[model samples]
Target: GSPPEADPRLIESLSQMLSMGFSDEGGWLTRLLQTKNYDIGAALDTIQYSKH
Candidate 1:
């Protein structure tokens, strides 16, 4: 069976996070998604608040 593809929103979120200075080291974004239970909206909200 083929592995499931990543969500496009997740990809976009990573891009935005990178642009906002979040690093990809240790898969930080992936952990964020997992920590937020895969809720992109919540994840984005978290990023925005933490960006300060």
Candidate 2:
């Protein structure tokens, strides 16, 4: 997989959420980082879905 910080905003959001101790943040961040590795749209959906 590519670097997780490839996307500045994405990493920023994830970092903030991670700092807040969001449950499964690592899980979802890994998912999002991987999702973003290949599919932008799907990664966005993954991010949105993980919000709730």
Candidate 3:
């Protein structure tokens, strides 16, 4: 089966996270997005909070 189409919001958020020095090892951000049910704001909050 074809993979799901990429979400622009996810890509932008991912690029932002990468620029902020977050690694995507083992799909960390993917899991974070999944855990947050693809809520970009909440996922970003988690990253921002953890980054501090």
Strongest candidate by TM-score: 3
* Model 2 ranges with Cα > 4 A deviation: 1-5, 32-52
Candidate 3 per-residue lDDT over residues 1-52, each given as its tens digit: 6557655456666666667755555676766665666665676666666763
Q: Which candidate, 1 or 2, would have the higher lDDT against the true structure?
A: 1
Better of 2 and 3 by TM-score: 3
Q: Model 1 — TM-score against the truth?
A: 0.43
Cα lDDT, model 3, residue 50: 70
- Model 1 segments more than 4 A misplaced: 1-5, 24-26, 37-52
Candidate 2 on 1-52: residue-level lDDT in tens?
A: 7776566666765665566543455776645654566343455555456764
Give the winner by lDDT: 2 or 3.
3
Q: What residue pairs clash in candidate 3, if any at all? A: none
> Per-candidate TM vs. native?
0.43, 0.36, 0.45
- Report every candidate's CA lDDT: 0.62, 0.56, 0.63
Deviation of model 1 at 13, angstroms: 0.9
Task: Estimate, for each residue in 3-45, the C-alpha lDDT of model 1 and write its tens digit.
Answer: 5665555666566666775544557586776666656467666
Model 3 ranges with Cα > 4 A deviation: 1-5, 37-41, 48-52
- Model 3, global lDDT: 0.63
Top-scoring candidate (lDDT) = 3
> Poorest 10 consecutive residues of model 3 by lDDT?
1-10
